[PDB]
Amino acid sequence: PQDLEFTRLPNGLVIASLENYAPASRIGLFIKAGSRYENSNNLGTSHLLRLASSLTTKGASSFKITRGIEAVGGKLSVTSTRENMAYTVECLRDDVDILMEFLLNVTTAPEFRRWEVAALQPQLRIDKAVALQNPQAHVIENLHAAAYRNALANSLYCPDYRIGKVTPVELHDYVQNHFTSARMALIGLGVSHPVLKQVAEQFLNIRGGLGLSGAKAKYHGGEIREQNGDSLVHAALVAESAAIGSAEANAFSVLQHVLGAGPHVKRGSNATSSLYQAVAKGVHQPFDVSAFNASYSDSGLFGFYTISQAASAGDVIKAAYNQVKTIAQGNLSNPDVQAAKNKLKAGYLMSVESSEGFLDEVGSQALAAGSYTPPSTVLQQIDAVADADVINAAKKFVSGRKSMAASGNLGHTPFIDEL
Amino acid sequence: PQDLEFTRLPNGLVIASLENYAPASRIGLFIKAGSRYENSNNLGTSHLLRLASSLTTKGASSFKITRGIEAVGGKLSVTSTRENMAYTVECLRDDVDILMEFLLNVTTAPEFRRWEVAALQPQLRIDKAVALQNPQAHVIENLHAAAYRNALANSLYCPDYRIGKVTPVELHDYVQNHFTSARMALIGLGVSHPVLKQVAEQFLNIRGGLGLSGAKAKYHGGEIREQNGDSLVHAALVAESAAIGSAEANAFSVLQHVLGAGPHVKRGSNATSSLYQAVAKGVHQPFDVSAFNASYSDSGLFGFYTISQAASAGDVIKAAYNQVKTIAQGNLSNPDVQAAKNKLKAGYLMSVESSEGFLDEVGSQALAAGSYTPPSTVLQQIDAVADADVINAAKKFVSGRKSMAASGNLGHTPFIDEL
Amino acid sequence: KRSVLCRESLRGQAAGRPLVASVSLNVPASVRY
Amino acid sequence: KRSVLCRESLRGQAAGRPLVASVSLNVPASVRY
């Protein structure tokens, strides 16, 4: 009924709200600290920070925090990316208040106690181990540290050597510099904006400029190769995408989808995916491949991802390249761009068809832009992409510094000079 | 009294002998199997082989073999490099026969039992662990794997993920293909050549062509970077040296020494070392740096090594480079080449002033050339280097594809584009 | 570990706003794109 | 682990024939250059 309602304060923190119909409300304070905010000396700190959400804080003891949310059946999620750190908080309409006071302690009143922080430590390993079970994570991580030099090249998981070395003043410092007013954006999916603001005003007024971590971007082509014993090999080939929320970017996204192979059908094969077709024809029976597309504030990464077997690595890898070269040679017919587009458009809408989705979308926008762009408008922008435009972007991957990451038996994985 | 005595057989194995005066004789069968002989599927099998030298074989049980040599106070060393694998055997004049029949079993009659080879496995980790304690080893190793692509970029030490997976058939196959007649060179320091031959003839006649592992060379510029928490940072910078036992090579060697900083004086600083001087002037108080120089059959690596602190890494690194740039700009006066030379000459002589040294030198030559070059001749060759030649070779580093490997806190370590 | 032998492979990463987003929650836990 | 704080550092690798030669012996054991 009522649409969202942004509001930038004197501090510069955004806040939105949508009194929905349904029973479940979800707040989520998105602070602007990503992994990119640590240095050589501070790497691994967000990670631990992320895992230390239920520790004692100034107004609520680790026990009350946990037992409290349990009391009411609430969930507290603490999600991060290379650029941002969403601190989600779900619960029942009636219990927001008990919950909110929890979110506020966790985030503005953390008390990292030598003893508490210390017992966590070991959790980092356990967490790293469980997320490093998907080749995608170690490759995708390897990719970012190869392709960048300094900031976004920092990984989300703490480096093995750092684990126990994460000290309490580190955590305290990171919160202090990054968990501040200018970098924050409250977001409610079932709360009153009037009452939201009041609270925001009372509890979210802290000072801290950007880049006390060392903000800045930079792209550097590079290759990280990880040999294994596994039959299968994964590798990523990616060139500087266009930046976040800009036209070039957007173009990339559309291009991405013309090749982009994220199955829309169970047990079904893509007819639409060019990459898949081209790869497929020159490739063996079992294999899988898809268009990769990442976009951040000050840089992007576009290119593809492959999963081939030992001997097929190159064949697939080049195959995929060659096909994306085709689009860069100019060869791309109108009929396919419109399909793409509609694919994209449908996806973005389904992305936001859920509370969780919507809440992310909104906060996300509040840290980039400073306001909420409605869907429609969104939809318009993607449509504005020219059929050429797409080609042109594509032209840029083929003619843009390469950067690859692979894993598995690398006898048959092309190097930079190979392609 | 009697000088060495080489003899190539019909098989193509080389054998030498020097009845010396003194009480200690030492055999050493050098088989041509280095770490460069393994593939993606075979990596870490030389390593295990190196460590399995006391296992049961056809004529001698592991127990007999070890208690046997103990009996007599012998030592059995199994040394290996990326290109070769020396199997050393020391003991008392009177006991060479008991000992030789051990070397023969160990090398031509290995019996890798599932159970025995399985117990070892864990030794690999222990061995790897102790050797990786010296930054030199992991950096040096990382160097080879970045500068090469296929063969010499294989490290000496088993890859973590392979350890328990090195199978018996693997050992049996590596022995079979590489531990063969054409690749072998016997070498005695206190044995009769007449009686050596006999034995060599009776026990070392096995067939096996080269490259069933996949022999071939190739250089590829690359950078492997290992972040740590250690104050100090090590880094290597190296471009394709000239090959083994060739003029260019030799040149490099001499240039190496002009900059080469291996202290000849305890607690003493080099006045000779250009690199050191130059580095020193632009550098802080505590630091250390040395010219690196590697030469193998089918390629080389020449360039320098640095050990700086976190914020000096670059300064040092560049400083070193610049100075080696100087020589390649032509700036190098005669006085310094002759000192260098004499430094090198001195060095080689001392290198061969020991039994162990001599026996390595001899075998080594056996595997490369096919005969023993006397010292004198050696000495002449090094002298032939031209004062320009040196510069010319140095020109090549500066104008040769770069390849670097660093460890430690890498905030201040130049990348390829940095220098 | 889950065997990845067949045609079924369909994992590659690329979403709209979020990319490689790692969750750690008091109750559940995961890795997405 | 041995502290490497002073001027003493003098480790860097480069020999004649041998380069990065690792020994494993029945009795002793090591890593040279």
Side-chain angles (χ1 to χ4, degrees):
Chain A
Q2 277 300 4
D3 337 297
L4 341 72
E5 190 174 19
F6 40 81
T7 285
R8 197 122 197 191
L9 296 202
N11 290 149
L13 92 177
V14 175
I15 112 161
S17 104
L18 265 108
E19 192 182 9
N20 201 351
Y21 68 96
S25 128
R26 6 160 110 215
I27 304 189
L29 164 86
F30 297 71
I31 320 150
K32 251 204 236 148
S35 71
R36 68 127 87 228
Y37 301 87
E38 347 146 333
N39 198 352
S40 233
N41 301 301
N42 188 182
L43 297 167
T45 274
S46 63
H47 191 84
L48 158 53
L49 181 47
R50 189 203 320 163
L51 280 198
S53 99
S54 303
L55 313 174
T56 286
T57 60
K58 177 255 148 249
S61 11
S62 184
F63 189 83
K64 166 105 126 170
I65 299 233
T66 342
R67 290 281 171 152
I69 295 142
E70 283 179 11
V72 163
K75 155 200 189 111
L76 186 113
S77 272
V78 172
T79 259
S80 17
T81 149
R82 259 156 247 284
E83 290 281 69
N84 285 312
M85 220 208 274
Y87 271 86
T88 262
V89 83
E90 201 258 350
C91 97
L92 261 255
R93 253 249 75 180
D94 292 323
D95 292 300
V96 173
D97 268 81
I98 307 185
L99 222 80
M100 191 145 54
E101 184 192 349
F102 272 152
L103 177 61
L104 296 165
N105 275 68
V106 185
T107 177
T108 313
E111 262 213 22
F112 301 77
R113 320 172 152 193
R114 103 204 34 170
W115 68 85
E116 302 183 4
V117 168
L120 196 49
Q121 293 305 347
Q123 195 54 22
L124 298 189
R125 251 177 222 204
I126 292 168
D127 198 9
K128 219 184 107 148
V130 305
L132 285 203
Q133 271 187 24
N134 301 314
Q136 33 181 341
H138 201 269
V139 120
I140 278 357
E141 290 269 280
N142 284 33
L143 205 44
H144 289 243
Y148 300 83
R149 229 179 90 196
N150 67 331
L152 321 170
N154 301 320
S155 138
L156 284 168
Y157 310 102
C158 184
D160 289 330
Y161 77 87
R162 176 103 202 113
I163 280 134
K165 166 122 141 172
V166 168
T167 87
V169 158
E170 246 115 11
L171 288 143
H172 185 86
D173 277 14
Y174 199 70
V175 188
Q176 122 173 324
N177 308 11
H178 314 262
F179 288 11
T180 189
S181 330
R183 313 165 132 252
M184 286 199 309
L186 233 56
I187 320 265
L189 190 84
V191 176
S192 79
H193 186 168
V195 121
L196 204 45
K197 195 211 177 309
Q198 194 189 356
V199 106
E201 304 179 42
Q202 206 134 9
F203 301 91
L204 300 198
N205 194 0
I206 310 143
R207 285 68 189 203
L210 292 162
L212 292 177
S213 33
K216 149 176 196 259
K218 197 254 166 336
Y219 166 87
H220 140 278
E223 44 183 0
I224 300 209
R225 299 165 108 238
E226 195 189 344
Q227 172 111 41
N228 261 22
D230 186 326
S231 55
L232 307 192
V233 26
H234 298 219
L237 203 39
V238 157
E240 202 182 354
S241 99
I244 207 122
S246 346
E248 278 191 20
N250 215 334
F252 285 101
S253 310
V254 187
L255 158 57
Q256 156 194 235
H257 274 291
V258 183
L259 300 115
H264 312 285
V265 161
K266 197 207 229 34
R267 284 200 187 72
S269 66
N270 301 314
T272 336
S273 287
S274 297
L275 236 22
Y276 210 91
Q277 278 343 335
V279 164
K281 274 172 216 139
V283 179
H284 185 80
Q285 325 183 346
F287 72 90
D288 180 323
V289 156
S290 199
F292 177 66
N293 169 55
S295 116
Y296 307 90
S297 136
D298 31 351
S299 159
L301 279 168
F302 160 103
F304 57 94
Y305 188 122
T306 52
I307 270 163
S308 2
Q309 345 169 324
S312 305
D315 309 315
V316 186
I317 279 137
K318 324 214 157 195
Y321 198 83
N322 262 2
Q323 187 78 349
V324 195
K325 276 219 220 66
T326 267
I327 296 173
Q329 266 185 357
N331 175 3
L332 153 63
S333 65
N334 254 70
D336 310 336
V337 146
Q338 190 74 0
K341 286 211 188 146
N342 284 316
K343 291 215 215 126
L344 191 44
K345 293 140 117 170
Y348 177 87
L349 282 170
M350 309 174 286
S351 288
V352 173
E353 98 180 342
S354 161
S355 94
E356 198 200 351
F358 191 90
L359 202 64
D360 192 348
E361 197 60 349
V362 177
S364 31
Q365 287 210 13
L367 304 182
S371 71
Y372 179 49
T373 289
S376 301
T377 302
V378 174
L379 288 142
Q380 295 180 8
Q381 303 188 347
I382 250 163
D383 232 326
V385 154
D387 316 284
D389 218 285
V390 181
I391 311 272
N392 188 30
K395 264 203 130 187
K396 233 229 228 156
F397 169 89
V398 211
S399 205
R401 190 126 196 232
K402 311 114 170 207
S403 56
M404 136 185 22
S407 324
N409 208 154
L410 316 184
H412 306 180
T413 310
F415 268 78
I416 18 101
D417 325 327
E418 250 81 4
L419 298 156
Chain B
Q2 275 301 4
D3 338 296
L4 337 64
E5 194 172 14
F6 40 82
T7 290
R8 199 123 193 192
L9 293 207
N11 289 149
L13 83 178
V14 163
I15 99 173
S17 142
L18 264 104
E19 198 182 6
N20 200 350
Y21 69 96
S25 126
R26 0 174 105 214
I27 303 205
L29 170 75
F30 298 70
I31 325 124
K32 252 198 229 115
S35 51
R36 83 133 76 224
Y37 300 89
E38 332 159 332
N39 195 353
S40 235
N41 305 295
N42 193 179
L43 288 190
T45 300
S46 94
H47 190 84
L48 164 49
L49 180 52
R50 191 192 325 164
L51 282 201
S53 36
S54 348
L55 298 203
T56 284
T57 32
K58 175 254 145 217
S61 359
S62 168
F63 188 86
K64 158 106 148 194
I65 295 225
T66 342
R67 301 278 170 146
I69 311 187
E70 287 189 7
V72 166
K75 141 201 211 139
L76 182 115
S77 284
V78 172
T79 273
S80 86
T81 161
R82 278 157 237 279
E83 285 288 67
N84 284 314
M85 211 197 281
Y87 273 87
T88 277
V89 73
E90 199 258 351
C91 91
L92 258 248
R93 253 254 77 180
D94 291 324
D95 294 302
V96 202
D97 268 81
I98 312 121
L99 225 78
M100 189 143 70
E101 177 194 355
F102 275 152
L103 173 66
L104 294 177
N105 270 73
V106 182
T107 188
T108 320
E111 255 218 22
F112 299 81
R113 298 149 167 220
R114 119 217 13 183
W115 68 85
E116 293 180 2
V117 189
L120 197 26
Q121 295 300 355
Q123 188 56 20
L124 291 191
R125 247 159 232 214
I126 290 162
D127 193 11
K128 196 161 143 125
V130 308
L132 284 209
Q133 275 187 20
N134 305 312
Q136 38 176 347
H138 203 264
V139 121
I140 279 8
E141 283 267 280
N142 285 44
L143 202 45
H144 287 244
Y148 300 82
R149 228 178 93 196
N150 69 331
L152 300 196
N154 301 324
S155 104
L156 271 174
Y157 302 100
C158 197
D160 283 332
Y161 76 87
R162 177 101 202 115
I163 276 152
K165 158 130 140 202
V166 176
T167 100
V169 156
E170 254 117 10
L171 291 150
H172 180 91
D173 274 19
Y174 196 69
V175 180
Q176 139 163 314
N177 310 6
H178 312 260
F179 284 17
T180 189
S181 303
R183 328 145 131 254
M184 286 182 303
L186 238 49
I187 318 278
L189 192 99
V191 172
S192 41
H193 185 168
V195 111
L196 205 61
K197 204 197 172 329
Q198 197 185 350
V199 107
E201 297 184 45
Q202 205 135 8
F203 299 93
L204 296 210
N205 194 359
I206 309 175
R207 281 68 188 206
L210 289 168
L212 291 174
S213 65
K216 158 169 201 196
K218 202 228 138 81
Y219 164 94
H220 142 275
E223 47 181 359
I224 291 167
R225 275 166 128 240
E226 206 186 332
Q227 176 111 38
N228 262 21
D230 189 324
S231 76
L232 309 192
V233 35
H234 293 217
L237 203 33
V238 170
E240 198 182 352
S241 148
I244 203 133
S246 280
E248 285 189 17
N250 212 332
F252 289 98
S253 323
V254 193
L255 152 61
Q256 160 185 232
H257 276 292
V258 172
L259 297 122
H264 312 284
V265 164
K266 196 207 235 63
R267 287 199 190 72
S269 49
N270 301 314
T272 343
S273 311
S274 253
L275 232 37
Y276 209 92
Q277 276 349 332
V279 170
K281 277 171 209 165
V283 178
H284 186 76
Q285 330 180 344
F287 72 90
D288 184 319
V289 163
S290 123
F292 178 68
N293 165 59
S295 152
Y296 309 89
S297 86
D298 33 349
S299 136
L301 279 161
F302 162 101
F304 61 94
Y305 194 110
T306 70
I307 279 126
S308 24
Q309 313 186 346
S312 317
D315 313 318
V316 173
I317 269 136
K318 323 230 177 209
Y321 199 82
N322 265 359
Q323 189 78 348
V324 202
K325 278 228 194 92
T326 283
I327 302 68
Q329 262 186 0
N331 174 5
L332 159 66
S333 351
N334 254 71
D336 311 335
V337 155
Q338 191 74 0
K341 283 194 180 183
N342 284 317
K343 287 224 209 117
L344 184 56
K345 288 138 106 158
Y348 178 89
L349 278 169
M350 306 193 244
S351 308
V352 185
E353 100 176 343
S354 120
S355 98
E356 195 201 353
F358 191 89
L359 191 77
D360 193 346
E361 197 60 353
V362 171
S364 52
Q365 288 212 12
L367 300 193
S371 111
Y372 178 51
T373 274
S376 14
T377 306
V378 178
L379 285 141
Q380 304 174 1
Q381 295 191 352
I382 254 154
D383 231 330
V385 154
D387 318 277
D389 218 284
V390 166
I391 314 305
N392 187 29
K395 266 195 115 163
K396 221 216 239 159
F397 172 87
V398 227
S399 190
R401 186 129 202 228
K402 307 114 137 184
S403 6
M404 178 185 323
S407 281
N409 214 154
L410 329 166
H412 305 181
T413 316
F415 272 79
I416 15 160
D417 325 328
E418 251 80 5
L419 302 154
Chain C
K1 15 150 74 280
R2 194 207 160 176
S3 304
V4 230
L5 217 30
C6 85
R7 63 175 199 188
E8 85 182 342
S9 323
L10 306 161
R11 263 173 221 203
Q13 302 186 351
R17 193 85 26 99
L19 165 67
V20 189
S22 210
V23 207
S24 93
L25 121 78
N26 196 8
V27 213
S30 90
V31 148
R32 19 171 124 139
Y33 77 55
Chain D
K1 8 150 78 266
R2 195 209 159 174
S3 295
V4 227
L5 212 36
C6 91
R7 63 182 197 183
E8 84 181 344
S9 353
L10 300 170
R11 260 170 224 206
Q13 301 186 353
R17 194 83 26 98
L19 164 68
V20 187
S22 181
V23 199
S24 129
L25 133 65
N26 195 6
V27 210
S30 95
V31 152
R32 18 173 123 139
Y33 78 54

